Amino acid sequence: RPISSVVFVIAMQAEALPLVNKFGLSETTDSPLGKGLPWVLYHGVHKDLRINVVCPGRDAALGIDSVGTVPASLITFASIQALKPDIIINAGTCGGFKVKGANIGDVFLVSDVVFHDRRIPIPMFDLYGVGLRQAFSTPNLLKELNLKIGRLSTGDSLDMSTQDETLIIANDATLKDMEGAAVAYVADLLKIPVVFLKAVTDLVDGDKPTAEEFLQNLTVVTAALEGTATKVINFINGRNLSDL
Amino acid sequence: ILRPISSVVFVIAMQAEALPLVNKFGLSETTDSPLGKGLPWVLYHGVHKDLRINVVCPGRDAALGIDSVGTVPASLITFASIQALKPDIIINAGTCGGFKVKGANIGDVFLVSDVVFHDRRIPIPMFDLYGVGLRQAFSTPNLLKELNLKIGRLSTGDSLDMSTQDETLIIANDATLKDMEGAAVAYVADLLKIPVVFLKAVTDLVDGDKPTAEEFLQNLTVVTAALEGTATKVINFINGRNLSDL
Ligand SMILES: Nc1ncnc2[nH]cnc12
Ligand SMILES: Nc1ncnc2[nH]cnc12
Numbered sequence: 181r182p183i184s185s186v187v188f189v190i191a192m193q194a195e196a197l198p199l200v201n202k203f204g205l206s207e208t209t210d211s212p213l214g215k216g217l218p219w220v221l222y223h224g225v226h227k228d229l230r231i232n233v234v235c236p237g238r239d240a241a242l243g244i245d246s247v248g249t250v251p252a253s254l255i256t257f258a259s260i261q262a263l264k265p266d267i268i269i270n271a272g273t274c275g276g277f278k279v280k281g282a283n284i285g286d287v288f289l290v291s292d293v294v295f296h297d298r299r300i301p302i303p304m305f306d307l308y309g310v311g312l313r314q315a316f317s318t319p320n321l322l323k324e325l326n327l328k329i330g331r332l333s334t335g336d337s338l339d340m341s342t343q344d345e346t347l348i349i350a351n352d353a354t355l356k357d358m359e360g361a362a363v364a365y366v367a368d369l370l371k372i373p374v375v376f377l378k379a380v381t382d383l384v385d386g387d388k389p390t391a392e393e394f395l396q397n398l399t400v401v402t403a404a405l406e407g408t409a410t411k412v413i414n415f416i417n418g419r420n421l422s423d424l
Numbered sequence: 425i426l427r428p429i430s431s432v433v434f435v436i437a438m439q440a441e442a443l444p445l446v447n448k449f450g451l452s453e454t455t456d457s458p459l460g461k462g463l464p465w466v467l468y469h470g471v472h473k474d475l476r477i478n479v480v481c482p483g484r485d486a487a488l489g490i491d492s493v494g495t496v497p498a499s500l501i502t503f504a505s506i507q508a509l510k511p512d513i514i515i516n517a518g519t520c521g522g523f524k525v526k527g528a529n530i531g532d533v534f535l536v537s538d539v540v541f542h543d544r545r546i547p548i549p550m551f552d553l554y555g556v557g558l559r560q561a562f563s564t565p566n567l568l569k570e571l572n573l574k575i576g577r578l579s580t581g582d583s584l585d586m587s588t589q590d591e592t593l594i595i596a597n598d599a600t601l602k603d604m605e606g607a608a609v610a611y612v613a614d615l616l617k618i619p620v621v622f623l624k625a626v627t628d629l630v631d632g633d634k635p636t637a638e639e640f641l642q643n644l645t646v647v648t649a650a651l652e653g654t655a656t657k658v659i660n661f662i663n664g665r666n667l668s669d670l
Binding site for chain 2 (some may be wrong): 214216217218239240241242243244246247248249250253254257258295297298299300301302304305307308309336337338339341342343362365366369370371391
């Protein structure tokens, strides 16, 4: 049987909105993931696919997107248990390494993902902290849409400490984000295939300030992210996991 | 109408930290997979006087076998445990690092005042405070006046070691204790409006002279016993009391 349900896990409202409009999704009103939660769930149906987009929502105290690994892991867990999707797509913005071939505006598919900020100097715990995990292989999607691909390194900091950099260079990542590896951890626990669409908003090895460049390109880059996400959804429609 | 506390959930990262407590109250490991269906999470249930006691652990990592420590698994089991078990209060009990300069000593079991993260650095307005994620533990003045436990702020991060960047932030946030799950458990407890208390037992001194991993593991067994003793006194104190009597 072909894929019939897809759940997008997106950290920022700014990243989700373009997709919500494109597919005419509606904000769920019956708090299916739990009562009193700030999480936002948009639902719709494109062709033969049920489409849901889940976001961690606004922090109650500050009012900004609840970015990071903890909220991403929670909404991934809750949405999987409630919706039982066939596949998860973690779509969002990220930092990229120019030396690795990444350019502003590129929307990457991810080969595998790791964490660069879970350092535990104990024999097996060390490999556990890194959490190397392969994304669901989608060779045909990659070929047909001609997307770039690379390894993603996740951490809860937007900046990059000296220690972070040493480890990121070591794991040879092309992309840097704040949720990916956590979404993969949860998808693994619940045995749900996960794919990533990461749009480069800033160059970590560039010259411009990370924060400034990120905010400056957010709008145009999330539009590009939607463009690719749309092509991905149309490609998945009618297909089975074996033909991606 | 408010009533006495009837259920308590202990969120414990390492099975080794939980076993002492499980054996103490003769809790049984639920084999019918209560919380989830197909997860490595371990749930021990039992009854002590007028309190239902649940102890949840992230369990063994399928790939490496060791305890699934860290903020992500802790947040997940806290979330799932709250929705399935509907506890009146959550107790995050476990080992931690302590700062000698802040008054911590090996073996001390601390009651946490508030908690923050030291490794979620987002150096921009508003997001910076979000990353720190300051949250206050549930107020238990009577418990503290009875057990006379030391108190202090807890700083959470997913690394057992301490980078130069981590250190600068921990010293700046004036934390007395350092762990790998606290702030995440508090984040989830706050989202679902469930009171949360922390019992953190010092296994190593971050500003001491011994290697962190070495001292941590060296004192793990003995300190976890001290943790059980305090956890037991806390359980017996809570019994018969309502949230306002804590
Ligand atoms: N440089 C970066 N690091 C982490 N997350 C990011 N999101 C966008 N740019 C990023
Ligand atoms: N120094 C330390 N840092 C983080 N978690 C710990 N658990 C025990 N000792 C610790």
